[PDB]
TrEMBL record, chain A:
Transmembrane segments: none annotated. It comes from Trichomonas vaginalis (strain ATCC PRA-98 / G3). Residues 1-41 are annotated as: Disordered. Residues 31-41 have a biased composition (Basic and acidic residues). This is Uncharacterized protein. It comes from the Eukaryota. The chain holds residues 71 to 170 of 283 of the full protein.
From TrEMBL, chains B, D:
Belongs to the tubulin family. It comes from the Eukaryota. It comes from Trichomonas vaginalis (strain ATCC PRA-98 / G3). The keyword Nucleotide-binding applies. It catalyses: GTP + H2O = GDP + phosphate + H(+). GO terms for molecular function: GTP binding; hydrolase activity; structural constituent of cytoskeleton. Keywords: Cytoplasm, Cytoskeleton, GTP-binding, Hydrolase, Microtubule, Nucleotide-binding. Its cofactor is Mg(2+). This is Tubulin alpha chain. Tubulin is the major constituent of microtubules, a cylinder consisting of laterally associated linear protofilaments composed of alpha- and beta-tubulin heterodimers. Microtubules grow by the addition of GTP-tubulin dimers to the microtubule end, where a stabilizing cap forms. Below the cap, tubulin dimers are in GDP-bound state, owing to GTPase activity of alpha-tubulin. It holds the Pfam family Tubulin_C. The lineage of its organism: Eukaryota, Metamonada, Parabasalia, Trichomonadida, Trichomonadidae. InterPro entries: Alpha_tubulin, Tub_FtsZ_C, Tubulin, Tubulin/FtsZ-like_C, Tubulin/FtsZ_2-layer-sand-dom, Tubulin/FtsZ_GTPase_sf, Tubulin_C, Tubulin_CS. Residues 40-237 form the Tubulin/FtsZ GTPase domain.
From TrEMBL, chains C, E:
Tubulin is the major constituent of microtubules, a cylinder consisting of laterally associated linear protofilaments composed of alpha- and beta-tubulin heterodimers. Microtubules grow by the addition of GTP-tubulin dimers to the microtubule end, where a stabilizing cap forms. Below the cap, tubulin dimers are in GDP-bound state, owing to GTPase activity of alpha-tubulin. GO terms for molecular function: GTP binding; GTPase activity; metal ion binding; structural constituent of cytoskeleton. It comes from the Eukaryota. Its main location: cytoplasm. GO terms for biological process: microtubule cytoskeleton organization; mitotic cell cycle. It is found in: Cytoplasm, Cytoskeleton. It holds the Pfam family Tubulin. This is Tubulin beta chain. Residues 47-244 form the Tubulin/FtsZ GTPase domain. It comes from Trichomonas vaginalis (strain ATCC PRA-98 / G3). Keywords: Cytoplasm, Cytoskeleton, GTP-binding, Magnesium, Metal-binding, Microtubule, Nucleotide-binding. Gene3D superfamilies: Helix hairpin bin, Tubulin/FtsZ, C-terminal domain, Tubulin/FtsZ, GTPase domain.
Length: 100, 430, 427, 430, 427
């Protein structure tokens, strides 16, 4: 209706001989066939009913650390002959013993 | 291989075929020129040098309809033999197109059909389109089927006809052509599908996003049903249905040969993106009276046959869920002697769309064919229309001079009455 | 050694047989190109049971494909394991099957019968140790219902001593894929009762029930259904191919399960069956297998044994298990459920053990039994057929092929005799 | 999983629904386009891809109100089939909206509601909104309940209507519409709640800090009450209450369903900064005669039903102390027939605030649903108003000329009189 | 060894069950994923009592979850310990019960009963020796009361020998959550009197009071309220789960405490209970536990026993203790309280010792006793039931489900008889 009016409108859509035309928004022209299925065949449970018994059931280890046993460290420090506090730490800082 | 042949008589039949061969060319990926930029053997013949030819012959008594294809973009595909046309139409007269003019060109049509039959290794049926109200469609089709019945005998003869609308009528002498043609089909046709224009107009106005459609829109909807029907043979499927399997399941009686057609989903260009279109949803949409291609209420009768063909993304498991849910509906009545009721077929090919088309682009669609007593209501309207004008003998002299013997009119009238009595008797539980 | 010949008389059987040979090739380790690539010497022990060896190491199955239209063969030939079959072991007609029993049996049946019997003779005469025939068909179809019984009658005339064991799919109770199936099953059973030795009944809706309940398959395909059927079929012949501490061949299974010539219809069932995610929660043991085998939710046939009583039943176990628990469990299950068994047959159940379980299972079991619950299945088709009796008009479609109406009365009288036979053996 | 469905009739119903679905989208985090930037299945359905749809249908006899939603920003979320618009309204005439015009479209609406319920597996209940003064709301509501009662049988039918105000009114023929509507819902409705605009205006002015409210602010208050009621069905809580629980608890008989509602706190977004509003604080505010949205005197109205739905932040011990403290008050007299008289719902979900709104950002809030004999006060006012006009036969000719029989007026008058007699009998001690 | 099957009904049952299995997992030392990460071999002696073992070193608890709506089911699944429960153990409907006892029993109880019974039988016959059933339910009306009593009868029909020990939370008789409680409670008691063996009554108000008085919780949260009930539950079965100097199972408790078949309702209590701060200063000994156990503020049933009289009393202990100290304390309390005991029963107090105490506490105890103080609870609900039946309000919902009011009269007649039996037995 450009011969009488300046038109920029959506709701009151005029018809056209071939088809009514769009008011909402749409994805690309040809695209989107609707609501696909999904499938999971019999074979996978054949595999899992065996392999569930296998390795993937292995438990997790512990992230241990080499924390010093200070008492045994002092035993070795005394045995080596470290007397002064600074030299005591030097042996205590370097030559660890991890706790049993 | 296995082959099908398509024959068209009348303006409507050819224009419906024009839509169908568009749909098939795109579906298989065949350019209009016949070259490629599969399963061609089901409908096409590989002539060598990359060109293909359809298995169809067009015959119209006037050249206007056929000249449209001759001057159109379609011309490079069809063999010039397959574009037969006369120079004088029957002009809405059954007697004129069956005796005075039909016998002039019927031998030419039969020879070309037989020439096409030589190349069909696995010929197992024919597709013929009629316009019941037309003089050319009814008269020439009657002579063609009677001749083809004795030419080949035990071969499936499936028809796709257009019934006159309950109120919309384009021909004044339409019932005269309708009854005489119906009397001739009823003895030869294996099974004739039934559609009407008025139901197509109402469906396209409500469901599809078209306000004032044309004949192109109606033909494309019919063409999709043809493609869905023929998809079982053309492509691999979980449940393939043969043409003869349709013959055994769809018409479980002697002469009851008129089922109705339905198609789902029929949705606009934007509501599909707004909707689930689940297997249960589309199945429920089929049985609702608003979605039928024939304007007859199933609540006036009962069902005795159903055939569902699923094209696309469809698990068989949901198919069993859908049909079981349908049987729970009290609004749908099934006769006692048909406990099975249904034939299902599942094919993996998705629906086909057309550039500048009318439909959505869905991932699953279902074509439905059902034989029911609701079609008996249409016969009552046709019979009453015929009786009113024939009582005053409204158009007898036009037919009589054109080769019609007056004794044939009561014979066809009695034949229609026998059809109505047969339809009513079957609907009675025993 | 102890050979079997497998006939796929129907298009459905060609699909089921296709999946079946995938299962057998997987079990024995046959590569998709026909060359053996297994992992154990025990596979090659009795490979002669199901396969012939061609010069070059290529192994070819003893299978024949039969159909009236070429639709299904194209799918199988293009299939993953379509190469394995013999190129000359494809027999197909050039006409529509039409889903019609009379048309398939008479019109195209006589045309193809002469050729198909000649092709079968290639496998029949080329195996010295032959004891077995395996027919796969559907009862509601057009090429397995009619032509399958045609082959069954001809083969019985040819080789009376060999066992004729067939597998059949029965039309579903609620809704089945074709309108005219009750007629097709009615005509088929008359030939099957007299000719066949062993009949296995499987229902599609029961397969759907098992998949949704136990496996929790939210979208079970045809492949899943065929796999379950192939599992039961493969387990039955396991005694013929592998060592076992208590063997049970086909003749053993026939003698134990069949008390009288006409009551030989069998229900099938396989264990273990578990949800894909719940298998880790299961302590798979013999009592668990016994619970699943006798569970009323695992049979592939939709017939409740609790509504009737039990005839002789059999169980076959695959996997490394000891005997004693198997003997104790079967003894306890018999003593626990006295009312469901029959007193005039002491030791109603039979047991068997095979050494090697199927791939992917550390042990599995196969259940085959016979009971009076089959009468409900016959009642379904009989009640439908009785209203189809008023559609003896509809039978005009059958007489157009050449059938006479009195055959249908002969067949229904046979079911009536069979139904009364089951009722009187209930007492 | 578990589902609800809502219908809105009349401009009052549609405009209320507009605000409610605003509130749900912000609560559930859904853009107006239906795409996300759970408990969705209770109210929304997933249409595939990335778009959602609401379980609502909007029906009216005039296109203006429906077209506003079609023109609004939220036009994208709703499905076009859900928006049903009539041609000409009932013109505040019950007879016109029930028989002459209502029957024209009633079959169309009934098809869409039943069709939407097909996707609605775990469904118990419906939400229907009415304008008692308006002819379409009362007239179409009667017919819709009449059809839904027999089509679905034992299903929870719950309604949220606007009762006529004791003095504020906009239609002169309002009493005629209300009495005839009351005669229909008294048999076809399981349980329906009512509020009046006069008390809504008063509460929106005193406790809330709006000098001059519009219909939008009142709709937002109604939406908050609806959101609290449906909170249990969507989120976990220490005490979850289902629809069937409400029906069993609130009513002691068949015809005494009508409850009253209350919501606390209703403090404004500005004044709320000063108060912590503990469990004891909010509990006491509910029972104030001023906090009721129905202008009824609690002194004349004994209590024999109560329901405490707490949203936000609560520990169950504080409820038990608060309930016990409330029971000690002498002014709040329960009936002898109801010692326990309490249902309480403790739900973890805090309330929601709308941008550009009016309510406070309260950490915890409580909604009240109770049945009291004070509602019998409103019936007498409506009964007397009807008697004054019908004494001189004020507007008989309009309703008679629209297909309604004259004798229906005394029938509904006697039906209301029985209701008032039942209320007096039940309120009496024994 | 000696197994027990655990059943949880409705909202209240599942939340308590979730807390109970959290406590049990802590006791035995089972990781929430199912792996055993305990510290004592003594946990493994009787792990079979409450657990089945799945292959792969995973344990599945003997818990069956039952509901009519999935709301509570989803909450348990999302819970911390929801992974332990077997997926198939979850049985639920698709309908909010509405707490109509007639609806929950006839309308929806019957259809779910068939599925639940078979699921129960799955675990019932999977144990070496079943001894008793454990049921947790609330007396609301929808599923815990209606469906709970229905399952109790069916289990009584199935297993007359086994002990049907049920735990009941009576509606709190000053503030409670629905108006239809007296109807549902009266019918539930009617069914529980005849078919149940041991009924444990717990009041929410007393649970609030204990948290304030002894635990000094600022707000008793439903997690901790369920924790105390779970602790009492574990102490009851602790004698079976671990050794002790003087054992006492469920059957021992029932025989000792119950003098006559009808009077078998029990009040429960726990000790030691201490605030989070003052536990450092407490000198916990046998006299301290005795004082807490017989304290009127630690009994979690809101019916003061001092108003009535006692009939039987039982005491459990957990931890290494001197048996003489326990024997002296029980004699000490018995002679002091002689005005609160029946003259015709000497030695009214039972004792028992368990070797291993609960985690965190060096010492623990559990009190269970029977008294005539239950006359108050029945009288209160009877008066409420009398009013509502006199007005005949709220009955239309129950009538629509098919329950006729003559059933209400029978239930009150039984309740009045129970009140009378307690009254004359007080003399
Ligand atoms: N669905 C559909 N129907 C059509 C179309 N075109 C025509 N028809 C119908 O088919 C009928 C054709 O009959 P006629 O108009 O008589 O043309 P004819 O078949 O050649 O018969 P005569 O020309 O009279 O000899 C018309 O009456 C229409 O109702 C079409 O494009 N689509
Ligand atoms: N609270 C509230 N009430 C409204 C609103 N709009 C209308 N109403 C009420 O609706 C009544 C008027 O009737 P309508 O809303 O027109 O009801 P109707 O179904 O459209 O009936 P008719 O218009 O007469 O055909 C008045 O009494 C108002 O109280 C609104 O936005 N908010
Ligand atoms: N389980 C299963 N059934 C099938 C399959 N293919 C076809 N059928 C069944 O076979 C029936 C059709 O019968 P038909 O194929 O003519 O039998 P046939 O001649 O023996 O192959 C249908 O109703 C299907 O239910 C399949 O792959 N799996
Ligand atoms: N102690 C305790 N009681 C609870 C809890 N949750 C709910 N309840 C009580 O359980 C009752 C509801 O029981 P319900 O599960 O609905 O039984 P049903 O109606 O028969 O199915 C209410 O009265 C609550 O007071 C909890 O976590 N702890
Ligand atoms: Mg024409
Ligand atoms: Mg209006």
């Amino acid at each position: 209706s450009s011969a009488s009016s300046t038109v920029k409108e959506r709701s009151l859509s005029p018809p056209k001989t071939a088809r009514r035309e769009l008011s909402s928004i749409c994805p690309p022209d040809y695209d989107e066939p609707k609501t696909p299925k999904q499938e999971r065949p019999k074979a996978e449970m054949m595999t899992l009913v065996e392999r569930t018994l296998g390795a993937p059931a292995t438990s997790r280890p512990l992230n241990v650390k080499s924390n010093r046993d200070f008492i045994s460290t002092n035993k070795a420090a005394l045995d080596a002959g470290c007397v002064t506090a600074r030299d005591f730490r030097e042996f205590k800082e370097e030559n660890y013993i991890a706790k049993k | 291989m296995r082959e099908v042949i398509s024959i068209h008589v009348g303006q409507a039949g050819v224009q419906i075929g024009n839509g169908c061969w568009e749909l098939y060319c795109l579906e298989h990926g065949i350019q209009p020129d016949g070259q490629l930029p599969d399963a061609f053997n089901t409908f096409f013949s590989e002539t060598g040098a990359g060109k293909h030819v359809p298995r169809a012959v067009f015959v119209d008594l006037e050249p206007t309809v056929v000249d449209e294809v001759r001057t159109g973009t379609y011309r490079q595909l069809f063999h010039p033999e397959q574009l037969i046309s006369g120079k004088e139409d029957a002009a809405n007269n059954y007697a004129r197109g069956h005796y005075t003019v039909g016998k002039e060109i019927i031998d030419l049509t039969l020879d070309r059909i037989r020439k096409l039959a030589d190349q069909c290794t696995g010929l197992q049926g024919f597709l013929i389109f009629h316009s019941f109200g037309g003089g050319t469609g009814a008269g020439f089709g009657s002579l063609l089927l009677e001749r083809l019945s004795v030419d080949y005998g035990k071969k499936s003869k499936l028809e796709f006809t257009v019934y006159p609308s309950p109120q919309v009528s384009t021909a004044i002498v339409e019932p005269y052509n309708s009854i005489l043609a119906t009397h001739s089909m009823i003895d030869h046709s294996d099974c004739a599908f039934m559609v009407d224009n008025e139901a197509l107009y109402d469906l396209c106005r409500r469901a599809l996003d078209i306000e004032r459609p044309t004949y192109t829109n109606l033909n494309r909807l019919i063409g999709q049903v043809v493609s869905s029907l023929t998809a079982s043979l053309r492509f691999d499927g979980a449940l393939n249905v043969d043409f003869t399997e349709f013959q055994t399941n769809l018409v479980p009686y002697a002469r009851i040969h008129f089922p109705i057609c339905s198609y789902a989903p029929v949705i606009s260009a934007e509501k599909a993106y707004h909707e689930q279109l689940s297997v249960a949803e589309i199945t429920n949409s089929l049985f609702e009276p608003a979605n039928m291609m024939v304007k007859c209420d199933p609540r006036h009768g009962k069902y005795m046959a159903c055939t569902l063909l699923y094209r696309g993304d469809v698990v068989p498991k949901d198919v069993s869920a859908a049909v079981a849910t349908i049987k729970t509906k009290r609004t749908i009545q099934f006769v006692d002697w048909c406990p099975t009721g249904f034939k299902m077929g599942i094919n993996y090919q998705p629906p086909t769309v057309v550039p500048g088309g009318d439909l959505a682009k869905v991932q699953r669609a279902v074509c439905m064919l059902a034989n029911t007593t609701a079609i008996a209501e249409a016969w009552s309207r046709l019979d009453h229309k015929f009786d009113l004008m024939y009582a005053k003998r409204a158009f007898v002299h036009w037919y009589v001079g054109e080769g019609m013997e007056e004794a044939e009119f009561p014979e066809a009238r009695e034949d229609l009455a026998l059809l109505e009595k047969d339809y009513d008797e079957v609907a009675a539980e025993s | 050694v102890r050979e079997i010949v497998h006939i796929q008389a129907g298009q459905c059987g060609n699909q089921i047989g296709a999946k079946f040979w995938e299962v057998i090739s997987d079990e024995h380790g046959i590569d998709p190109t026909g060359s053996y690539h297994g992992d154990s010497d025990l596979q090659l022990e009795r490979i002669n049971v199901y396969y012939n060896e061609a010069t070059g190491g290529k192994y070819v199955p003893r299978a024949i494909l039969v159909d009236l239209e070429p639709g299904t063969m194209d799918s199988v030939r293009a299939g993953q394991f379509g190469q394995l079959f013999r190129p000359d072991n494809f027999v197909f007609g050039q006409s529509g099957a039409g889903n019609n029993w009379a048309k398939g049996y008479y019109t195209e049946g006589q045309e193809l019968c002469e050729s198909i019997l000649d092709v079968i003779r290639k496998e029949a005469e080329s195996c010295d140790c032959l004891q077995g025939f395996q027919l796969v068909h559907s009862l509601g179809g057009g090429t397995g219902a009619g032509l399958g019984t045609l082959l069954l009658n001809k083969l019985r005339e040819e080789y009376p001593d060999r066992i004729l064991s067939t597998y059949s799919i029965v039309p579903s109770p609620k809704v089945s894929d074709t309108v005219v199936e009750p007629y097709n099953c009615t005509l088929s059973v008359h030939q099957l009762v007299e000719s066949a030795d062993e009949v296995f009944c499987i229902d599609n809706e029961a397969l759907y029930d098992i998949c949704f309940r136990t496996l929790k398959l939210t979208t079970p395909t045809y492949g899943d259904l065929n796999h379950l059927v192939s599992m039961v079929m493969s387990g039955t012949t396991c005694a013929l191919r592998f060592p076992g501490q208590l063997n049970s061949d086909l003749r053993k299974l026939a003698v134990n399960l069949v008390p009288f010539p006409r009551l030989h219809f069998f229900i099938v069932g396989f264990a273990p069956l578990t949800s894909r995610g719940s298998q880790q929660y299961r302590a798979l043991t013999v009592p668990e297998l016994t619970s699943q085998l006798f569970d009323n939710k695992n049979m592939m046939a939709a017939c409740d044994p609790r509504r009737g009583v039990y005839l002789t039943a059999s169980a076959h176990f695959r996997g490394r298990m000891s005997s004693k628990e198997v003997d104790e469990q079967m003894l306890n299950i018999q003593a626990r459920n006295t009312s469901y068994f029959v007193e005039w047959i002491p030791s109603n159940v039979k047991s068997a053990i095979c050494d090697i379980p199927p791939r992917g299972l550390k042990m599995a079991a196969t259940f085959i039994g016979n009971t009076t619950a089959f009468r409900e299945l016959f009642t379904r088709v009989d009640s439908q057929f009785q209203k189809m009796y008023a559609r003896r008009a509809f039978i005009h479609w059958y007489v157009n092929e050449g059938l006479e109406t009195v055959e249908f009365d002969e067949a229904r009288s046979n079911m009536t005799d069979l139904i009364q036979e089951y009722e009187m053996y209930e007492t």
